[PDB]
Amino acid sequence: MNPIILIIILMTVMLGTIIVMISTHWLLIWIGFEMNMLAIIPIMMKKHNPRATEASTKYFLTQSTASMLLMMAIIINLMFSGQWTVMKLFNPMASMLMTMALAMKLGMAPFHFWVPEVTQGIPLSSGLILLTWQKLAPMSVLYQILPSINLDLILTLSILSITIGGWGGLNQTQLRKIMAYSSIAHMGWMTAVLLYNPTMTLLNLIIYIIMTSTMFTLFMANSTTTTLSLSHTWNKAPIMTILVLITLLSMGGLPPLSGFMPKWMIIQEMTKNDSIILPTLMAITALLNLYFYMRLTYSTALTMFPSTNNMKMKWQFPTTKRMTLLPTMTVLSTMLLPLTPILSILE
């Protein structure tokens, strides 16, 4: 690693995502996804273990076949009414292939098998940047191409994403796999409301990016991969414990806390449409994806595990880790309940 090379590759990730955002041409959207891939591969393998090798291999294969299936859908779009305009499509087949390519690219339950495996063997900075930008970049495209999608596609992907991201997570004790299963569940939530009012989807994108930044920042502050290490960081610092409490319960989404606002507003502009059994099923699965948060809390801050010494040694040294931006994102991620009418900040 060189810092010049890393800042240049960060600039290329920024450039690729902005080209995905701004370009009215389909080729440049595909080029933006590809440049995002080509730059995000050496963000992984920041170490040199074979873990990152296998992880970047699996990510590259799924990422590349997603990109090529997107190009397939675009060339079918030009087989029909032929112009390079980001608009309503002209085929249920091309829209079908495009939603499946963006579900492979995004992370979705028939295609979600690569996400926990790729998050197991990478450093936390690489996992943070891949989760944030790879859940950011296709949402702009779906926000653009919404008016020509069969809802069976999006809704089956969303329901299955919420229930599989729930049911995975009870058995996994790696922190990265827990965060990845939470990511699959929240992307199901952010996919479900796409054909109804996408302002909710982009606001939930803002909220979830803030939440993931707080989570992986609070795991950058202490090199922890298991919950036993979280008990040792209970022993060495007390304020990390109450922030794990409040931020994990904000991932849980309880009404005094900021993570309830993306669920609640979705249920609002979901039940002004006359589907009701689908909101109550989704929200029962939202009750389901809180237990692994809860046992994570019970490991960290509300029970007191026995601790190894040399924390006796560590108490001399300061907590001199740098934090990128922890407290701003923390209290923005937890205390954003009474700012409900900031929905209108988006459109």
Partner 1 sequence: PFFDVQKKLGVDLDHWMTIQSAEQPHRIPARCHAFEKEWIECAHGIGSIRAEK
Partner 2 sequence: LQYGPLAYILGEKTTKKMTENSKLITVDGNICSGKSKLAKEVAEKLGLKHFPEAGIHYADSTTGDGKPLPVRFSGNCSLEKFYDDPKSNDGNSYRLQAWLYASRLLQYADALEHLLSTGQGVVLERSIYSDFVFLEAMYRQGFIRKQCVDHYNQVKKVTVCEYLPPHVVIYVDVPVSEVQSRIQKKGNPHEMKITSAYLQDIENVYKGTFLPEMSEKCEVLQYSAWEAEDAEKVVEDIQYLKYDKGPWLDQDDRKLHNLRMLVQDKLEVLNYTSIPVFLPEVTIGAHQSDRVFQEFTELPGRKYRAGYNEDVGDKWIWL
Partner 3 sequence: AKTLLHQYWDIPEGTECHRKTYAATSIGGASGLVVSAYSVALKTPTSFLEGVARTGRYTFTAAAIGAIFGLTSCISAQVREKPDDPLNYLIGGCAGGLTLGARTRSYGIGAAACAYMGLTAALVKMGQLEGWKVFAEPKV
Ligand X SMILES: CCCCCCCCCCCCCCCCCC(=O)OC[C@H](COP(=O)([O-])OCC[N+](C)(C)C)OC(=O)CCCCCCCCCCCCCCCCC
Ligand Y SMILES: CCCCCCCCCCCCCCCCCC(=O)OC[C@H](COP(=O)(O)OCCN)OC(=O)CCCCCCCCCCCCCCCCC
The footprint of partner 3 (CB under 8 A) covers 151-152, 155, 195-196, 272-278
- How many residues of this chain interact with ligand Y, rule: CB under 6 A? 4
- How many residues of this chain interact with partner 2, rule: CB under 8 A? 29
Burial of 137 (0-12, 13-18, 19+ CB in 10 A): buried
Cβ atoms within 10 Å, residue 107: 24
Cβ atoms within 10 Å, residue 24: 11
Q: Which is nearer to partner 2, 48 or 272 (CB)?
A: 48
The per-residue b/e assignment along 109-120, b for 16 or more CB within 10 angstroms, e otherwise, is bebbebbbebbb
Q: Which range touches partner 2 (CB under 8 A), out of 21-29, 95-103, 132-140, 313-321?
A: 313-321
Find where tokens 């080209």 sit.
19
Q: What mask of x and - would describe binding to ligand X in positions 63 to 102, judged by CB under 6 A? A: ----------------------------------------
Burial of 7 (0-12, 13-18, 19+ CB in 10 A): exposed
CA distances from 87 to 72, 101, 104, 201 (A): 17, 17, 21, 19
H/E segment holding residue 209: helix 198-220
The verdict on 291 binding ligand Y (CB under 6 A) reads: yes
The verdict on 80 binding partner 2 (CB under 8 A) reads: no
Q: Which range touches ligand X (CB under 6 A), out of 138-146, 181-189, 274-282, 288-296?
A: 274-282
Q: Which range touches partner 1 (CB under 8 A), out of 35-43, 66-74, 136-144, 326-334?
A: 136-144
The verdict on 46 binding partner 2 (CB under 8 A) reads: no
For the segment 16-45, give every residue that binds partner 1 (CB under 8 A). Answer: 21-25, 27-28
Site of interaction with partner 2 (CB under 8 A): 1-4, 222-223, 228-229, 232, 235, 304-322
